[model samples]
Target: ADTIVAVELDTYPNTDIGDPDYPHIGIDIKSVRSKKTAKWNMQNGKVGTAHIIYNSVGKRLSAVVSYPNGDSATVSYDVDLDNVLPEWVRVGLSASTGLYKETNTILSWSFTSKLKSNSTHETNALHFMFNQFSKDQKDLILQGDATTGTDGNLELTRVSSNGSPQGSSVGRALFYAPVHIWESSAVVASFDATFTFLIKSPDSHPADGIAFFISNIDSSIPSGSTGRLLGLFPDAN
Candidate 1:
């Protein structure tokens, strides 16, 4: 299976998994073991920046992450993506703190692309400020309790009027339509995505998190499983 390819920033090393002793970045294809890694010092608080660049001609994927302290780390890998991923891909994000509590916020994000299958005038793009949402939003698919707050933010997890916690909730805001990622007979598309997000916590110990993902469209959230598995997981699990 052409499962998933990710450029991951692993903050905590898992001794049993043979992860590096310190925080590191890697290119993961299907499994973490086959990754090319580089040591990096990424902390819990502060704004960090990263850039992912792909050279289709050379088939090189390069990433550079800048720490809050003015230092940076870089990693890259050479591979033919046509053999690694499917023609159609879904793009989204996810995050999890598990027992560690944190409030994840996406400040700003964007995606742009140029596919060889398209004519010069054709373009593929996605732009979201996440400022507000409406029931009539035709371009978006909002799931679970995902809604707009009075402050105009897209609140994934809701709080009661008295500010009580809503435990273990899962929410999602997705594009109503899927993008055509690649055509097997055509050249692979070149794309880039950028994000600015914040993670905070009031609890001494937080549980679960969120993520941004790009996968197969069949992996969408199941409406019947909303209340239990945080929208993403299937009812069978």
Candidate 2:
């Protein structure tokens, strides 16, 4: 069978404040089968970090780069996709600065998927499940900007008025991509993931950062931040 493949690209506009006057770009790829390899490359020296997540079920790879001038780009690849199940892949490209608030920005994404076989069972498919949000929307979910805890630790809270909101607060806007099933054919998936308007205090920082999950649950199920969110497990607290 022909190798299944997918490609996605996006660009977000800049804001007056808290915005990357330049813009950042990134890419992510998931593999469904074991021992299956995926390769990626970037142009114009627009690549910074490449992250790969592997599990008994599948593998996820992401590439990111920020333009010193403020522009960014990303590319992702998914290979040997037959074992992966339903899940969400969170890709965050920008960080909030304690220096500004009410910054408006845009996110643009493009995606493509190709399957090796045309059979109904071999119809490797990709589905986008949600919309990108604005920084304000994200802050609204967190309730307020995150702050250090009493013990000099960072805390993720859902504030009634002054705290950051929970993940569920964003409604369906926080939805992520669905799992792709690859048959004997090659498949490709692509789309734009973007957010606008954001506010950041000079002291504020990105919570544990973004994540990818392959669980029976949805991405909006609000998990704990700090070490818990970063470790792929919810905090018992």
Candidate 3:
């Protein structure tokens, strides 16, 4: 029997098998605040029985699978450790689409490294990912005005008090942050932990979302409005 050792690749744009022929095996997004596992299984050298626990932080991808022989692999894609907001900062989704104009909401996240604060090397390497919303964009999707509270909190609301439609809405948001590296530390050599979040929505229903990474400075860049944040910003210089 061989001792199973997990492999982790942390880079920019993506972290997995670059080969287009094969689907990368790992978490695509860098920041995962919270997740609820419904069905997770790795069987017969293949990934099987998997589902999204709730609305992901942003528009990215990630996965964790175990091999039959005891070997396991964790992969992440398009993990941005820099700016997690959209490029067009002022553009409001509700204003543009006129979908959910009556209300406003905010999304927020925080972190505490399991490896410890002294482990700056590894602590810095750890990245956070998330998405942003605009007035017009939110209108088109019939979502709401996405705002960040003064305490860096995210307020997520609904477009209509009556709740116009009832169904699953699919969307994706990009995030880019910095990576923390490990130089010398036994307790913080590697990282393996789960993120949790306190989500608030008008319908109280979880929206299907994923987190991704784009080329940027740290995960705190101020993207423009809506679509521009996903690597569509020009003046990022």
Candidate 4:
């Protein structure tokens, strides 16, 4: 879809999808095809800095990336957020790999906004019990292959009946209802979630992984965005 606004530090190029041949930084408005591209020769072992800024008045989105090796680049795009995004929106970062496998790590991050909200809501403590799949269950919503395992453990993805873990399977367990995250476009909600999960793979090369996320209430797994993407984005190439 052409609604995913993003600023990307692309490491690899998918020539079939309009990406430059070398690693670079780009600003994408509504589609994967970047609106502005800048040279960014990323070093593998060194840390890099990415500063993304959006000017509400000018409606400009800009990205500046710099590495320890003195490589740096800046890119920007002009887009009307009022026309593209809702009053209240979700912000996130996504890293993906195609065919090849690698890990992306973030050392630190911070976000600041100029707009102030008209109202705010106090944080509240809300807890849920997943003791078992009982008849009165209402705290959790499970989709795909999620189910309760031994001792009320929430198993997201599981092995098949023939004792083989299914590849490219997606399991989602969400809170039964949406929680208040913002008030009049100002950040209000503040909470931390802690959970433990186990991943078991028979072979050395594990398939995909799981994540604990809070997204739009109507969000769903993008079809074909499986495997290395962790079912997060639409397949681009």
Candidate 5:
């Protein structure tokens, strides 16, 4: 019924939309530049912020991108909600500049789902922790191998056992179960949710990049949404 996502990256490589070869350095909420796109112009040591809201009732998704210098971009989508979404929702972390060496980092993330007040209830909320996982959660599914633990924190890159290659792998965390102990699933016009996490490289500087997304897809391992698609578009379209 409702979904909200947010991400902030402190530093990244510079980007130019006119250069024809410049890689973008920002967050991808729903689709990098497609349905519900969120991206902007940014440079090294810049600040990037991306936010998304999905309303199932109206079959809509809204995205906003905030740049380092107080600039921003935004987009929205109106599509078949059922066709774009699966039985469960998916959240993702993306960083792909064509090179494995160009890595990106996500310092923090936050996710919250709150329903509008009605005569029946004062508050309808989705409770979660920040940075790390909490005890009140179960039925959580983690895809992409982006994060390390089962507690539900998403770490895009990880330190090696011997500290050689820097970070080992990429990861993603999914919560496929119910939020409330007594409920397995429910539907509503809209709900509010947010998640903050970090993304970065294992070695000096960074490469490729990363994104935060919400799709009908259930997992975040990226199907290599290649070419100029910029890690957006779904595989089979």
Candidate 6:
């Protein structure tokens, strides 16, 4: 076979699959050419289970491969990529044949992803879970200002409408530092953030609440956009 399988990180010049799909990062299965993996270790015709785990932050990768007839081994590799797309963190698989290569049928293929970090927030290639909070409790924006804190976290309300005839003031707050968590020039990054706050009322009456939002750079919030949608929607229709 000319090329058994070609895998890439959906990014960069490789975007043009029409031109040989020469991507920046990929794995080539070449037996005679003495490529990355050995033909015996290839497990081309093996039947059983295979699993891969990758940690983007710490930069570590390991795999467990096994097949029927009692054959197994723990494989580790340095799969460092330089052209990983920020948005496309997906894995895809397809097959084609050479020398009158005939397309084959799939018997079975499976995979899994999970957070394996020791910190409050864990990360990986596919799914991540984050559990961070202040000392007191957790309150989604809808809980109002009576149950929120702003010691270090961004204050979401610009103005407090807790006056005599309260419910007219619009307060706004920004997350302040905008770190590139989604994508970088040479890596794939995904982020999970949990916001905590309380809405404490100085007077007898508590007014309208706030909202927790994730928005784009341009279509994001604007100060003084309170009492309406909390600087969320700029639509006028």
Name the top lDDT candidate: 1
Across 56-92, the per-residue lDDT of candidate 4 in tens digits comes to: 4566777777775677778877875556554443343
| Candidate 6 residue spans exceeding 4 A from truth | 1-35, 41-48, 63-65, 72-75, 81-87, 100-103, 114-237
Indicate the worst ten consecutive residues by lDDT in candidate 3: 2-11
Query: Relative to the true structure, how large is the alpha-carbon lDDT of every model?
Result: 0.51, 0.27, 0.24, 0.51, 0.42, 0.28
Q: Write the per-residue lDDT of candidate 6 for residues 21-132, one digit (tens) a residue.
A: 2212222221111122211122232333344444345443444444565554443445332222222222222221111111111222233333334454544433321133
Off by over 4 Å in 4: 116-221, 226-237
Model 5 poorest 10 in a row by lDDT: 1-10
Per-residue lDDT tens digits for candidate 1, residues 166-199, read 5555555555556555555445466565544444
Candidate with better lDDT, 2 vs 3: 2
The TM-score of candidate 4 is 0.55
Residue 70 error, candidate 2, Å: 5.0
What TM-score would candidate 1 get against the native?
0.66
- Candidate 6 lDDT (Cα, whole model)? 0.28
lDDT of 5 by residue, 106-204 (tens): 444555654444456654666443555533324445444334344443444443444222322444455553432111233443433343333333434
Off by over 4 Å in 3: 1-26, 29-108, 113-146, 150-152, 156-179, 182-187, 191-206, 210-237
User: Residue by residue across 121-214, what tens digits does model 3's lDDT show?
Assistant: 5343343322333433322112223333333323332233463322222122222232232222323322232221222233332222112222
**Between 1 and 3, whose lDDT is larger?**
1
TM-scores, one per candidate: 0.66, 0.35, 0.26, 0.55, 0.55, 0.31
Which has the greatest TM-score?
1
What lDDT does candidate 5 reach at residue 88?
47
Error of 5 at 213 (Å): 3.0
Better of 5 and 6 by lDDT: 5
